[PDB]
Design a protein around this ligand. Structure first.
Ligand SMILES: [Mg+2]
Ligand SMILES: [Mg+2]
Ligand SMILES: [Mg+2]
Ligand SMILES: [Mg+2]
Ligand SMILES: [Mg+2]
Ligand SMILES: [Mg+2]
Ligand SMILES: [Mg+2]
Ligand SMILES: [Mg+2]
Ligand SMILES: [Mg+2]
Ligand SMILES: [Mg+2]
Ligand SMILES: [Mg+2]
Ligand SMILES: [Mg+2]
Ligand SMILES: [Mg+2]
Ligand SMILES: [Mg+2]
Ligand SMILES: [Mg+2]
Ligand SMILES: [Mg+2]
Ligand SMILES: [Mg+2]
Ligand SMILES: [Mg+2]
Ligand SMILES: [Mg+2]
Ligand SMILES: [Mg+2]
Ligand SMILES: [Mg+2]
Ligand SMILES: [Mg+2]
Ligand SMILES: [Mg+2]
Ligand SMILES: [Mg+2]
Ligand SMILES: [Mg+2]
Ligand SMILES: [Mg+2]
Ligand SMILES: [Mg+2]
Ligand SMILES: [Mg+2]
Ligand SMILES: [Mg+2]
Ligand SMILES: [Mg+2]
Ligand SMILES: [Mg+2]
Ligand SMILES: [Mg+2]
Ligand SMILES: [Mg+2]
Ligand SMILES: [Mg+2]
Ligand SMILES: [Mg+2]
Ligand SMILES: [Mg+2]
Ligand SMILES: [Mg+2]
Ligand SMILES: [Mg+2]
Ligand SMILES: [Mg+2]
Ligand SMILES: [Mg+2]
Ligand SMILES: [Mg+2]
Ligand SMILES: [Mg+2]
Ligand SMILES: [Mg+2]
Ligand SMILES: [Mg+2]
Ligand SMILES: [Mg+2]
Ligand SMILES: [Mg+2]
Ligand SMILES: [Mg+2]
Ligand SMILES: [Mg+2]
Ligand SMILES: [Mg+2]
Ligand SMILES: [Mg+2]
Ligand SMILES: [Mg+2]
Ligand SMILES: [Mg+2]
Ligand SMILES: [Mg+2]
Ligand SMILES: [Mg+2]
Ligand SMILES: [Mg+2]
Ligand SMILES: [Mg+2]
Ligand SMILES: [Mg+2]
Ligand SMILES: [Mg+2]
Ligand SMILES: [Mg+2]
Ligand SMILES: [Mg+2]
Ligand SMILES: [Mg+2]
Ligand SMILES: [Mg+2]
Ligand SMILES: [Mg+2]
Ligand SMILES: [Mg+2]
Ligand SMILES: [Mg+2]
Ligand SMILES: [Mg+2]
Ligand SMILES: [Mg+2]
Ligand SMILES: [Mg+2]
Ligand SMILES: [Mg+2]
Ligand SMILES: [Mg+2]
Ligand SMILES: [Mg+2]
Ligand SMILES: [Mg+2]
Ligand SMILES: [Mg+2]
Lengths: 189, 110, 141, 84
RNA sequence: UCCCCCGUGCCCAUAGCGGCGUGGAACCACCCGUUCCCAUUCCGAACACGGAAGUGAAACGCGCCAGCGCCGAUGGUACUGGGCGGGCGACCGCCUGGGAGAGUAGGUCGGUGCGGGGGA
RNA sequence: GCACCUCGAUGUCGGCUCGUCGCAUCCUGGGGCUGAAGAAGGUCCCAAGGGUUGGGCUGUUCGCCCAUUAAAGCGGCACG
RNA sequence: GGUCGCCUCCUAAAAGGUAACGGAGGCGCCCAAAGGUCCCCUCAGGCGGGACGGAAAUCCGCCGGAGAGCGCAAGGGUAG
RNA sequence: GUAGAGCACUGAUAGGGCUAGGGGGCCCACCAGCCUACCAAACCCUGUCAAACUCCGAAGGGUCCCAGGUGGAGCCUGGGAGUGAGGGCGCGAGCGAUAACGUCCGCGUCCGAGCGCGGGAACAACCGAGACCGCCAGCUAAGGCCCCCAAGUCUGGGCUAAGUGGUAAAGGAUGUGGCGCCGCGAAGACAGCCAGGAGGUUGGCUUAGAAGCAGCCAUCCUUUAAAGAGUGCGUAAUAGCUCACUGGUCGAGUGGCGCCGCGCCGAAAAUGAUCGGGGCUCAAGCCCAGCGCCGAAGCUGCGGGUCUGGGGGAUGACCC
């Protein structure tokens, strides 16, 4: 369903101090607005893993006005793999693009009779209004064989959500699995 | 990408715009023929004889000859003398050529 | 063994390893992963022993993604020579990992079958390591 | 007890220093003749009152400050702007 | 002084690639011809010249879109002049000043100075 | 490897004499597991108190060999 | 054993400069045209196109800002 | 044009997409169709690496102008030298082994020449600090304030139980403390004490007898208030029967992952030991906070000497 978490304001205190202080800086911003902020990390963590960048969350400011948000680039602290900043895109009524969770369903005929698929593209880029935010993008996959694949010119796409990537881009493929019989002629070279 | 015309312009143009002298920029039309006088250092035109303004006719190269005689007097009134003839993509033969030796008739130095 | 199949230059300098990685600090192909906790050079010798380790874990099945390549020439002076008289001949090949860089990913593998898997492959390594699963933070990256 | 079949380097050669680059700077008084920039191929272009030597050296032609100009895709220029 | 046009300078692709349009009375172009000047490692393609029948197809001009290229923040971070502490080390942390590259939001199908030739 | 004391000198190998110390233990003492029936043996732990042979060959240390042994331990001490 | 003068690049820490028996390369010539000028012109390459004829001889087409070329090493520069 | 950073060029590069020829059946081409869990060019998307790659690009550093800056500053001309083995430390590189009290450069410092002074147990170059002379005067600096040893057995909160502290790594463990997160809890939980632990489970299974454990495979269906072509001690083989399982009983918690603090193992050396020693365990250890005080040849106080500029002197001397 829809998502929501607090979001207090900042005029630019110490991003260092603030980040240490149990919380997390970042900015809310769109073609019209642009505002320094900071949410709680642990609450963000709570919220983000399920929401991410394909479910629209909304931000309760201290001055109320709960604007519809969508994340535009999270900043991962490379050494520690922990966030340190969130770009928060407030949505007007627009075809403002975003990536939507692709649903490979019915496990491929390559797999159970061979190896296993490879989710090259867990989600897909697409132009669509704030209204149509598909929780799924159910796309068949049980026909794809070993050493086969499909492209973005092979998608369901519900109405208004017509793709913003490319019809040539690839989405998923079943690969051969690492046999230990292979290991023989590998390092014997 | 540039045209044979476009390259040939700069090629002779730059040869002259870096002489410091007043550049007399010409233009050959199939209709008639004109030419101004530019102090490129600023960018202003000093004076501008022509064949559409002077609205003459009667053989292209003889009205090419005349326009320069206009330039000569009409520029020498403003104490102009340092002349550097921007011959454009066109050569120095016939049309644009006659304009020069016509501009020389007045007293213009070049 | 993972040698560069063509080479622009022969011997190559040492260079210190200050700081965190430059990329690949977020999973991108597999479900789980292995990462650096501390910086080192990794030999093709090491890398291959980790691969072979996992490959033997889910014998027949699974797909291994390995996100680092030995592109640096690990030169070394022959046995019992004094200083100078040039640089060592190239003895090995190593790859520069800094903390955060992702090394081994797996897909088509159970939960613990990729825990025990990416566990042992951690043991064939000169460095402390963390295993971490793909997450939204990686999808947003 | 020591040395054995010691490899000789085929290199260890090297060029002289050319001490190139920019010798006078913008808003620096110069007289006529001075060298403003030594270079190998117009990284800098011969402006007004700035000449260019047979090796692409760039020397002042008249006095008063040098001045740098950057005309984007056209080139970097330096001219001298005469006295007062 | 406002506008279109021609010849031009200048910022440096926000200018450009592409597709869509419209402009010929003016001015510009193609277009007419090889007689003359001039002209092609062959060709009036080009350069030249005498022209004014055709035209706006081409090019160019003004414009429209954003598919490409282009430019492109705020916020945070990497790094660091300077001042400290930290680890056997490989190296890590804090202070103070400075602070990117990518990427995100967005912008962009140009902007103008000098003279001339039309419109009112 | 380095070139830090010592080139107005710190005598090298091996043997002989005398040893003494370390323990990563050859022997004996004490243990665990055993693919330990017993005997025997294996590997590991504890433990340095004492012990740790005589010859052939070769300058040799080493090593091979002969005959024994509870065992015929290595190593530090300017390779005492 | 190798080296010894010269040039290019890197090391060289965004001025110049900077060592090592550091990492990579070249020079000891050449050109009466490869020079001076004036006029003129424009690459590599790729796709389609075509007797011999070709992955590539030459001719045609549309796309190309520079990846060609600039005697020879490399860097800078460079089709205004 | 460096750190960074980025592949836009130069090259590397993992995968996947797509696609030449090679490889290879289909054909058996005399040649076409080629299909691709084969090799894999250009080419595409994901993901990267580079001193000698650059679409980018710092902090800074140069250099001129302008302003502060009177300093054992700077400049011009001359007299005289000495030096032309440097070393260590910090940082930035190369070489070396991301070895050396190694080596070779760049910046800086210090020693050299400050082996004068305080710390550092001791000890050129680590910390503090630039010794003109005197003083049984005072403030401090690093470091310290149980005793040797000057000054807190000061103060408040917390951790550690190894003498860790008082020398070490991969890796290992219900150490002790401290945070999370999830799962089972009176839809009676964990743990034990237990009526139970039924069937065409008549084992697909032929050989000295394989009615449940080498015998190779719907790993067969049962009453389900309760289950296995067997986790089991009988294990090719009657007795005997454990549990996974269920029901009571019990009556409050329990099991799992993760992180942070401080410990534990890992840990073997040669003349006699040791943290400088004695000795220390709500510290005399570790962190956090606060306040005193000890402490140098630094600073101050007082006396003096000296050279320099300054005034006096409207004079050398002499005086401040
Ligand atoms: Mg700011
Ligand atoms: Mg494939
Ligand atoms: Mg296929
Ligand atoms: Mg010897
Ligand atoms: Mg050089
Ligand atoms: Mg124009
Ligand atoms: Mg039209
Ligand atoms: Mg008409
Ligand atoms: Mg048309
Ligand atoms: Mg156009
Ligand atoms: Mg207009
Ligand atoms: Mg206009
Ligand atoms: Mg308009
Ligand atoms: Mg307009
Ligand atoms: Mg529009
Ligand atoms: Mg737009
Ligand atoms: Mg648009
Ligand atoms: Mg950008
Ligand atoms: Mg510093
Ligand atoms: Mg330090
Ligand atoms: Mg900033
Ligand atoms: Mg900072
Ligand atoms: Mg008008
Ligand atoms: Mg009128
Ligand atoms: Mg003897
Ligand atoms: Mg002895
Ligand atoms: Mg012992
Ligand atoms: Mg042993
Ligand atoms: Mg025994
Ligand atoms: Mg004997
Ligand atoms: Mg013996
Ligand atoms: Mg020895
Ligand atoms: Mg010896
Ligand atoms: Mg010995
Ligand atoms: Mg010799
Ligand atoms: Mg200089
Ligand atoms: Mg030298
Ligand atoms: Mg092509
Ligand atoms: Mg062809
Ligand atoms: Mg043909
Ligand atoms: Mg043909
Ligand atoms: Mg051809
Ligand atoms: Mg060349
Ligand atoms: Mg370069
Ligand atoms: Mg280049
Ligand atoms: Mg590949
Ligand atoms: Mg590839
Ligand atoms: Mg492959
Ligand atoms: Mg194909
Ligand atoms: Mg670089
Ligand atoms: Mg930029
Ligand atoms: Mg900047
Ligand atoms: Mg003075
Ligand atoms: Mg003098
Ligand atoms: Mg004199
Ligand atoms: Mg003199
Ligand atoms: Mg000397
Ligand atoms: Mg000395
Ligand atoms: Mg001394
Ligand atoms: Mg001493
Ligand atoms: Mg001292
Ligand atoms: Mg000292
Ligand atoms: Mg007391
Ligand atoms: Mg507490
Ligand atoms: Mg554990
Ligand atoms: Mg209930
Ligand atoms: Mg059975
Ligand atoms: Mg029974
Ligand atoms: Mg528990
Ligand atoms: Mg003590
Ligand atoms: Mg206390
Ligand atoms: Mg006095
Ligand atoms: Mg006197």
């Amino acid at each position: 369903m829809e998502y929501r978490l607090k979001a207090y304001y900042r005029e630019g205190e110490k991003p260092s101090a603030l980040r240490r202080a149990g919380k997390l800086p970042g900015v809310m911003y769109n073609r019209h607005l642009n505002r320094k902020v900071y949410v709680d990390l642990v609450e963000f963590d709570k919220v983000f893993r399920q929401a991410s960048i394909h479910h629209v969350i909304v931000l309760e400011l201290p001055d109320g006005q709960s604007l519809p948000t969508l994340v535009r680039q999270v900043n991962l602290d490379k050494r520690r793999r922990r966030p340190e900043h969130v770009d928060f895109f407030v949505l007007s009524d627009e075809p403002v693009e975003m990536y939507v969770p692709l649903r490979f369903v019915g496990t491929p005929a390559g797999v159970r009779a061979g190896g296993v698929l490879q989710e090259i593209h867990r989600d897909i880029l697409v132009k669509v209004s704030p209204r149509n935010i598909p929780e799924f993008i159910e796309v068949d996959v049980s026909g794809l064989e070993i050493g086969d694949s499909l492209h973005a010119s092979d998608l369901k796409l519900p109405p208004g959500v017509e793709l913003a990537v490319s019809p040539e881009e690839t989405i998923a493929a079943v690969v051969p699995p690492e046999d230990v019989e292979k290991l023989a002629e590998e390092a014997a070279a | 990408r540039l045209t044979a015309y476009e390259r040939r312009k700069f090629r002779v143009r730059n040869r002259i715009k870096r002489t410091g002298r007043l550049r007399l920029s010409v233009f050959r039309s199939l209709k008639h023929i004109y030419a101004q006088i530019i102090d490129d250092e600023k960018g202003v035109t000093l004076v501008s004889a022509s064949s559409l303004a002077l609205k003459l006719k009667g053989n292209k190269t003889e009205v090419a000859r005349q326009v320069g005689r206009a330039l000569a007097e009409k520029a020498l009134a403003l104490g102009i003398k340092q002349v550097a003839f921007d011959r454009g993509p066109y050569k120095y033969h016939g049309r644009v050529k006659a304009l020069a030796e016509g501009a020389r008739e007045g007293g213009l130095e070049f | 063994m993972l040698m560069p199949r063509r080479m622009k230059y022969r011997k190559q300098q040492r260079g210190r390893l200050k700081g965190a990685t430059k990329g690949g600090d977020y999973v991108a192909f597999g479900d789980f992963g292995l990462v650096a906790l501390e910086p080192a050079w990794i030999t093709a010798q090491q890398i291959e022993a980790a691969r072979v380790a996992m490959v033997r874990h889910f014998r027949r099945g699974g797909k291994i993604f390995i996100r680092i390549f030995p592109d640096k020439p690990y030169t070394k002076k022959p046995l019992e020579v004094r200083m100078g008289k040039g640089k060592g001949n190239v003895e090995g090949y190593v790859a520069v990992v800094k903390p955060g860089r992702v090394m081994f990913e797996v897909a088509g593998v159970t939960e613990e079958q990729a825990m025990e898997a990416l566990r042992i492959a951690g043991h064939k390594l000169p460095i402390k390591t963390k295993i971490v699963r793909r997450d939204a933070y990686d999808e947003a990256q | 007890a020591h040395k054995k079949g010691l490899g000789s380097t085929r290199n260890g050669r090297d060029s002289q220093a050319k001490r190139l680059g920019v010798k006078r700077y913008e808003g620096q008084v110069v007289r006529a003749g001075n060298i403003l920039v030594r270079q190998r191929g117009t990284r800098f272009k011969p402006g007004k009152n700035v000449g260019m030597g047979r090796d692409f050296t760039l020397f002042a032609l008249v006095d008063g400050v040098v001045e740098f100009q950057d005309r984007g895709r056209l080139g970097r220029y330096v001219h001298v702007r005469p006295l007062a």
